[PDB]
């Protein structure tokens, strides 16, 4: 199974006074392991998972230095983009950057990404071959030409194929008891009458990890979406996730209906029935 390391950066300009609000988080798969918050007192990169606390003072000093450099790059960027898009200094604006890498089941580099947004829209993104750029508009074209001239892509690719994968590998190992453990969804079905003649069947999946999952309803062995309901997948708060899916059915006919659960932790999909 592949694994990913992603870093998420958000800078929000504060036109009234001061520097932008800047928040960085780092993830392995669906597990946040570090953060930086400019509003916080420490002005340090901080641990958010036990297995990263293994790292010594020099790791935290290095990460702190780099993430601080990141904050300033984004501050500069917010100014430059205001200029590109001819905006006043009155409004608050947002720059987001996400980058990271995947390793495959062979534990080797699988893919890399580096994506940039301004005010919640695509601005510029490294392409899958990590050698060129997708520019969304004409302002991003400037950035693209500037970055081609300074061969940023070559430098990024070096990071995404070397340092990035190397450290994902290290983290995967150190945190193997959680990061490499799948939590199969604990499933069950509930049932309650909505009338004398109808009932809602709700198929629950709880406490699963990673987030990726599919719940599907069937009637007499064919997919049914009509008269069904659902929630988007949600964090339980303890590092695991939850989802459910419901159908309304004629009462007495509950046995026709099956809930099917697909998840990595499940060797084979699970079929739940009322009774």
């Amino acid at each position: 199974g592949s694994h990913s390391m992603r870093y998420f950066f958000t800078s929000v300009s504060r036109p009234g006074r001061g520097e932008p609000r800047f928040i960085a988080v780092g993830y392995v798969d669906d597990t946040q392991f570090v953060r930086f918050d400019s509003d916080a007192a420490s002005q340090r990169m901080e641990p958010r998972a036990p297995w990263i606390e293994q790292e010594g003072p020099e790791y935290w000093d290095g990460e702190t230095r780099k993430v601080k450099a990141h904050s300033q790059t984004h501050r500069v960027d917010l100014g430059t983009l205001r200029g590109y898009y001819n905006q006043s200094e009155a409004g608050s604006h947002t720059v987001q950057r996400m980058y990271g890498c995947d390793v495959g089941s062979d534990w080797r580099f699988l893919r890399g990404y580096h994506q940039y947004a301004y005010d919640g829209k695509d601005y510029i993104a490294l392409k899958e071959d990590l050698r060129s750029w997708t520019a969304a508009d004409m302002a991003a074209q400037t950035t693209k030409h500037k970055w081609e001239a300074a061969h940023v892509a070559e430098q990024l690719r070096a990071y995404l194929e070397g340092t990035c994968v190397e450290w994902l590998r290290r983290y995967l190992e150190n945190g193997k008891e959680t990061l490499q453990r799948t939590d199969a969804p604990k499933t069950h079905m509930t049932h309650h009458a909505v009338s004398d003649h109808e009932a809602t069947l709700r198929c629950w999946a709880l406490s699963f990890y990673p987030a990726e999952i599919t719940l599907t309803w069937q009637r007499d062995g064919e997919d049914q979406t009509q008269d069904t309901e659902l929630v988007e997948t949600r964090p339980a708060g303890d590092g695991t996730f939850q989802k459910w899916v419901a159908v309304v059915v004629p009462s007495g006919q509950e046995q026709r209906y099956t809930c099917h659960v697909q998840h990595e932790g499940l060797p084979k999909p699970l079929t739940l029935r009322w009774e």
């Binding site: 870093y7 960085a24 780092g26 290095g62 990460e63 780099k66 993430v67 450099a69 990141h70 300033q72 790059t73 500069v76 960027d77 430059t80 983009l81 980058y99 940039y116 601005y123 510029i124 950035t143 500037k146 970055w147 300074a150 940023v152 430098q155 990024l156 990071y159 340092t163 990035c164 190397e166 450290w167």
Partner: peptide
Amino acid sequence: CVNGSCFTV
């Protein structure tokens, strides 16, 4: 581990 090289837009 974050990178590593910083470049402005």
